Every structure is written in structure tokens, then in C-alpha cells.
Swiss-Prot record, chain A:
First-to-last residue of the parent protein present: 217 to 735 of 735
Similarity-based family: Belongs to the parvoviridae capsid protein family.
Alphabetized GO MF terms: structural molecule activity
Lineage of the species this protein comes from: Viruses, Monodnaviria, Shotokuvirae, Cossaviricota, Quintoviricetes
Biotechnology: AAV capsids serve as viral gene transfer vectors that have been shown to affect long-term gene expression and disease correction with low toxicity in animal models, and are well tolerated in human clinical trials.
Record's protein name: Capsid protein VP1
Gene Ontology biological process terms, A to Z: clathrin-dependent endocytosis of virus by host cell; symbiont entry into host cell via permeabilization of host membrane; virion attachment to host cell
Domain notes: The N-terminus of VP1 is sequestered within the mature capsid. It contains a phospholipase A2-like region and putative nuclear localization signals.
Subcellular location: Virion; Host nucleus, Host nucleolus
Curated annotation (Swiss-Prot), chain B:
Family designation: Belongs to the parvoviridae capsid protein family.
Protein's UniProt name: Capsid protein VP1
Top-level division of the source organism's lineage: Viruses
Record's miscellaneous remark: The ratio at which VP1, VP2 and VP3 proteins are synthesized in vivo is about 1:1:10, which is the same as in the mature virus particle.
Protein's cellular compartments: Virion; Host nucleus, Host nucleolus
Biotech / industrial applications: AAV capsids serve as viral gene transfer vectors that have been shown to affect long-term gene expression and disease correction with low toxicity in animal models, and are well tolerated in human clinical trials.
Purpose: Capsid protein self-assembles to form an icosahedral capsid with a T=1 symmetry, about 22 nm in diameter, and consisting of 60 copies of three size variants of the capsid protein VP1, VP2 and VP3 which differ in their N-terminus. The capsid encapsulates the genomic ssDNA. Binds to host cell heparan sulfate and uses host ITGA5-ITGB1 as coreceptor on the cell surface to provide virion attachment to target cell. This attachment induces virion internalization predominantly through clathrin-dependent endocytosis.
Whole sequence portion shown: 614 to 674 of 735
Domain notes: The N-terminus of VP1 is sequestered within the mature capsid. It contains a phospholipase A2-like region and putative nuclear localization signals.
Amino acid sequence: GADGVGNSSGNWHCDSTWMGDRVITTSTRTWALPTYNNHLYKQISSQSGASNDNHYFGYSTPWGYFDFNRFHCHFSPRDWQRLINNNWGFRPKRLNFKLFNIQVKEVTQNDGTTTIANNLTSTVQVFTDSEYQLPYVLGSAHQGCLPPFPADVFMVPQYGYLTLNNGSQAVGRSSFYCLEYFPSQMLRTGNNFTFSYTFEDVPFHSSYAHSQSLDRLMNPLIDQYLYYLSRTNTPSGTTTQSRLQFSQAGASDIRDQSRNWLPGPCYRQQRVSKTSADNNNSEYSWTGATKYHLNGRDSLVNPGPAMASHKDDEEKFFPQSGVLIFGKQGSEKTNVDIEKVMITDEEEIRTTNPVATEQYGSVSTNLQRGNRQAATADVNTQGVLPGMVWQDRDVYLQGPIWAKIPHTDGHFHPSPLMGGFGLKHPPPQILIKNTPVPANPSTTFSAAKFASFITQYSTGQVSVEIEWELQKENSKRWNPEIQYTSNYNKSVNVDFTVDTNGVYSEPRPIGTRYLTRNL
Amino acid sequence: QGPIWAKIPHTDGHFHPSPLMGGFGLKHPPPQILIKNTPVPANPSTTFSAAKFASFITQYS
């Protein structure tokens, strides 16, 4: 840091600049940090009797952490539109981080009034691990983001983690991390903190949608030179006999043509409808779910593999867990009606990824003979096969930007299943805490742990700046594209704006896929 | 958990100075660090008196 109590440690920077090829964004927010857990660590675990699936064991810490991982932190609704309408892809490159204008307040709750005053000599300490030595919590899509709207103020969320358990009990291999055991940087009023970071090379995210379905790749005018088996028998006299005929596949045969490629893999979902009348009356929620089984307990696959949500001309149906779901403004935690949630749509991927609610295809179950008749069965789960292409899941406007790839001997197509960018060395976790200030010890000496501290909290401003790389488009498409538009009719409230009471709200999910490409 | 070192007494003779609780005998061990709060007197009387102050601001660090 630098200088005094009266001097300011940083300016407010929130802006976006568009350079053409690369592009740069900036934002600044205001935060407040409480003391958590009365300055002490605690182990936490599952509560008494619980399902074998719900057991957990871990620790909670006094430390907080910053999360900018959602897009809406970085991009405004309009800045989001020189991106998704004008471009075929984007990726991050490098970022900056800064804290400044730190001030610490102590509070006195005596009687029915609470007085608050500056504590000028108190400190707040911050570090960034950057060696990836801690359990990495970010990327699990928790709350506690920097707000989407720059004028809001937010608390910093508390930090904690989980470790191997058996039931509600720990195992010998289970690990315990003390955050005090790292070098950090102690800051007072008039001290600031910075670091900078560089993304590893990662593929552009695909903001295009395809103009060709994988099942139609070819010229309708010209027939193939390959033959397929067409008729298996022919009438002879009164009744048929076995005769094999072959054919070349034309535009009337398009079903039957040879191809060089296959659709992507599927792991199948249950289908439900937004119209309440079509759905069965029972509780199938947990029973009818698709799950995976790991170490004797069952977990839902909430996003699951990337698959189209519905087929043509059914907009009413979506996979049970297969989609992301966002809440509207002020929605509650539990048991809330469908009118409150916002359900995203995965469609444009129909052309490669198969629909999530249907089988991959059909396969032959048996060997035919004279007295046996051919039999097939549906394959509801398919792994990856050579010659198989697919697309990934869209990032939308608000959702995960990145995730940390687990450190393991093998992995396949690491792009993460919620969306965004898989990173082996992602942006490091930033951790922050209030330094404990003891209160009025006894006159005689005693060896005991202090239970008594001054009650205080801190606040300041944080800033983030990321540099993005863009991919422009050369398209010879003659006719116009599909663009993201706001409706021009009159309305009581404007979208993406404060209401009369001053609560900013986001009307609908906005994906990145509009501009079209050929497959 | 236990003694790292001890100070060997200053004497004309000693035998195998390694200390009996454990650890490292040292003739010049790490020196003692000593710390105190400076007394701040409180509100003396107007007329002069020669006496030792019994009254101080109550403070800690």
C-alpha cells in the first residue's frame, strides 16, 4: 500500500473498451466482511439420521473469499451484445485484481442502541494461494457473486470445505487445512492489494449455431455410387420367397444413405412438460431420476452430458435435470412454483447432439435364420465411438465462466458440464479475514484460549479487469441472421432495469448462440 | 512438545551438559525478550505534592 489515513488508495474503474480483435472489461463493487465463527475453526458434518447419500464431513473457517466467476459480473446487457451478435467465439486471456479503500469499524451493542466507530489501527489480511494447495471451492456455482448491477453492495461469503467420510465419521486419510499457515499480507487503512494472472491457452467458446444437420450433409441432386440392402424378399407365385435386392440411395432414399459421421453420446433423461396436465400424478422426482453410483451412495447428474432439450415443434417438454434453471427476482429457496423459475433452452445443438429424452438408436439383438426373425432393442446410453462429433453446452449470460479440472491420471474432453472453460490452473482463490483484536484480559496470568474479542467488521472496494480474445466471422450467407432483440412494444417496466422500488432484475436467460455457421 | 534448549549454568565445571529434560544445552542461549506497557498517569492534583502516584490510566496492548 501507500501513504496516509487521509489519502485515498484507489480510483473507481468500471468501463468496457472494444478494440476489435481483443476486448477488455472492468468493474468495481463495494463489499462488507463480517467475522465468522467467532475467530475459530469448527468441524461440521451431516446431522444425525440422514440418507446415506446426504452424509458429509468437513470444516468451516473464519475466512471469506471473493467470487467473480459469473459472466454478469463482467459484462453488462448491452456489452454482451457486441459479443454474441457480432462474433463466432471468445475466450479469456489475462486478468487483474485489486483491493483498496479499506476501513474497519468496531461496534458497541450496549442497551438498545448500537454505536459504530472507526478503528484506525486494526488490520485485514489477504492472500492468494496460487499453488492450488487448498481445496478448490469455486466452480460449484454457489451464491456470493459480485452483483450484476454495479451500484449494489454485497457480503463476502464464508469459506469451508469437505473431506472423505464414512457415514458422518472421518477417515484416517481425511485432511485438515489451517489457513493461518500460509503467508498473507496484512492491510490497514491506506494499504492496497493487487495481483495479475494469465489464462492458459483454451479453445474459443462456440457462439455459432449450425446451418446443417448432421443427418443431411450431401447433394440432393446426385445419387451415390454405394449400394444398401433394400428389399429382403420378393413375391413368387402366391407367397414371397427370400431374395436380396440392392439399391443406390437418391433424394427419395435420403434416410438410407452412407455417411462418414455419427452423433454424439447420450445418457438418457426423463421428460416432463410445462403444461401441468400431461405430467403423471405421483412422486417420481427422486425415483425417476437419472443417477450415478459412487461408493455406495447415489447422486443425481444435474446438468448431465450435453444434449438437446426437445425435438422439432415440441416446446413444452424439457429433461428432468438436463437443463440449467435460474430463479427470477426474489425467488425463495425451497418448493417454489414454475412461474418463479427461468428454464434455459438447449435446442440449436439438435443438429449434432441427440435429444436428451430419447434413445440414441437401435441395435440388433440376435442372429436371424430361417425359423428365427430379426430382433432389435433400443440403446438408451452410448459412450464415445470413433467418428463421433458433438457440441458443448452454452454459457448463457449468468453462469459459470470456468471450472478447475481435477488433478487425475486421465480425463476426456475436459470442457466442464455446466459450461464454460476447463482450466488446469484457474484463477486462484482470494481469501480475506478480519484480524482478531482481544479485549481487556485479566490482571493475573492464565493460560487459556481467549473467548472475548472486540466486535468489528470491515468494508472497502474491489476491482476486476479481464482481457478477452474475439473471433470474427466471414460468412457468405446471403439472407439475414437471427439477432438478439429487445421487444419494442410498450410495457410497465424496461427489461434489465430497476423498478419503482429500486431492485434490479433480469427478465430472461440470454445465450451466446445466434450467428449461424455451416456444419 | 517440550524443551528445545536450556542455559548451561555458569560454573567452574560440568559434565556432559546436555540437559536432563531434553534438547540442547547452550552457554549463550536465545536471549530473553522483555516487554511492558509504559505507565500513563491520570489527572494529578493542582497543588504540588511529593508522593508516588497510585493512579494511572487503565490500558493494555
